[PDB]
Design a protein around this ligand. Structure first.
Ligand code: CU
Ligand code: CU
Ligand code: CU
Ligand code: CU
Ligand code: O
Length: 456
């Protein structure tokens, strides 16, 4: 297949306190030119899977209309929300039904967020078939960065939703996760574009990289001929870092989002820069290297902006006297466990969904150190709902640039221990039921998921 121009998703300015219908439905998309692929899409204002824009402090009034053919619910991945507005599997609605999310205030920092379905056992299916979209929150820090660099969505502020998928001869998607290894696609897509290219100018570009794959992690570099080009991590799932972090590669797992700045003024006109995936070395399942995307520096520019010294304030969590919660990732006869338990171990069908089984319980305002201990042969990108966290320590090596800042998904390599810090402070007048689960969608679907509770 010839190189294809990178698709840039549409955008939707989500109004403040005004109800918006988000409809999941079956349709046909032309991913490969000349072929119709049956896929699911979120429809918002006659746009398919648009980039949703939010302003920090606004009211978020969403109704999920489910025409997907099965139970479903939208999860606002990374949001601090009341849990009945968060998209918990208990609240999934049947086909033809609507879930009205109670109003809540956007209180998260500016950055790149993620909306996708969260139904029990079918999240891998629905995400893979097309229910996935990016959210961009804006605050005053994003305003100053946008001015410093003259950023503009679709111009030099570019989403890169990276996904791997497999197509049959007729252009239909093939979803055959092998056992408990997660799904691994044969074809790499960016914003549902196979083998993509994008023309760039000699300017600074911001790329919001979102791993929307079911299981595949990426180790991404920018190759300019022989050498690896430099670039800067500026943000993670929970928003901007304190300062830019210069790197020459980033590791991004499913559920992670990495915001980077790339200064194509490093390159000459007519250069081609390959966004390349190297072996991820996190021990169907594939560890190969391959090009993700090609950038063509086609035009010169008078761009004279500088990468700023400071991006935002990331306040470190005070961990003195914090409670420790050890979360051991095991496997029980080809079934991955969390502290010896799966979702099917009392969590799946609560007698009272307002007071279900929880793995552990905390009081509002508790600082907790969570200690993931991976005793399995596979990596797990572990995600908690309700709060962002700060990565304290990895037993296998130093923190990586992508480990900094406010995170909500941390890579836990085979036989690795990772310590994170969570300030579980929420402004709600009711107790909260939040998920803790692996973000390899098949793992999550086959039960690597529990509740935890934070009281009022
Ligand atoms: Cu998610
Ligand atoms: Cu999530
Ligand atoms: Cu997992
Ligand atoms: Cu989740
Ligand atoms: O999630």
């Amino acid at each position: 297949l010839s190189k294809q121009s990178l698709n840039i998703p549409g955008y939707f300015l989500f109004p403040d306190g005004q109800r918006v219908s988000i409809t999941a439905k079956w349709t046909t998309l032309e991913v490969i030119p000349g072929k119709s692929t049956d896929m699911l899409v979120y429809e918002i204002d006659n746009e398919y899977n648009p980039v949703i824009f939010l302003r920090k402090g606004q009211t978020f009034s969403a109704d999920f209309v489910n025409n997907s053919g099965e139970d479903s619910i939208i999860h606002w991945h990374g949001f601090r929300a009341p849990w009945k507005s968060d998209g918990h599997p208990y609240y999934a609605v049947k086909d033809g039904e609507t879930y009205s999310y109670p109003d809540f205030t956007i209180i998260d920092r500016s950055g790149t967020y993620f909306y996708h379905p969260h139904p029990h056992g079918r999240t891998g299916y629905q995400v893979y078939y097309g229910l996935a979209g990016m959210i961009i929150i804006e605050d005053e820090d994003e305003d100053n960065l946008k001015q410093a660099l003259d950023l503009e969505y679709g111009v030099i502020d570019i989403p890169l939703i990276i996904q791997d998928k497999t197509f049959d001869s007729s252009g239909q998607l093939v979803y055959n996760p092998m056992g408990h290894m997660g799904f691994w696609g044969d074809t790499i897509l960016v914003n549902l574009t196979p083998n993509p290219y994008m023309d760039v100018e000699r300017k600074i570009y911001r790329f919001r990289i979102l791993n929307g794959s079911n299981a595949r992690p990426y180790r991404l570099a920018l190759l300019r001929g022989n050498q690896r080009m430099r670039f800067w991590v500026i943000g993670v799932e929970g928003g901007l870092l304190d300062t830019p972090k210069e790197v020459n590669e980033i590791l991004v797992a499913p559920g992670e989002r990495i915001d980077i700045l790339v200064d194509f003024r490093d390159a000459s006109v007519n250069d081609v820069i390959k966004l390349y995936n190297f072996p991820h070395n996190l021990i169907m399942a594939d560890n190969s290297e391959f090009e993700v995307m090609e950038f063509r520096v086609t035009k010169d520019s008078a761009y004279d902006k500088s990468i700023p010294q400071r991006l935002s304030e990331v306040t470190p969590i005070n961990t003195d006297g914090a409670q420790v919660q050890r979360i051991t990732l095991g496997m029980r006869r080809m079934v991955f466990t969390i502290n010896g338990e799966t979702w099917e171990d009392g969590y799946a069908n609560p007698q009272d969904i307002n007071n279900p089984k929880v793995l552990f319980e905390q009081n509002n305002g508790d600082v907790v150190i969570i200690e993931y201990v991976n005793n399995t042969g596979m990596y797990h990108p572990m995600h908690i709902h309700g709060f962002q966290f700060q990565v304290l320590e990895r037993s296998l090596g130093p923190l990586r640039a992508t480990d900094l800042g406010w995170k909500d998904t941390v890579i836990v390599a085979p036989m690795e221990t990772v310590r994170i810090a969570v300030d579980m402070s929420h402004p709600y007048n009711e107790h909260q039921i939040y998920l803790l689960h692996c973000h390899i969608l098949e793992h999550h679907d086959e039960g690597m998921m529990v509740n935890y509770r934070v009281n009022a």
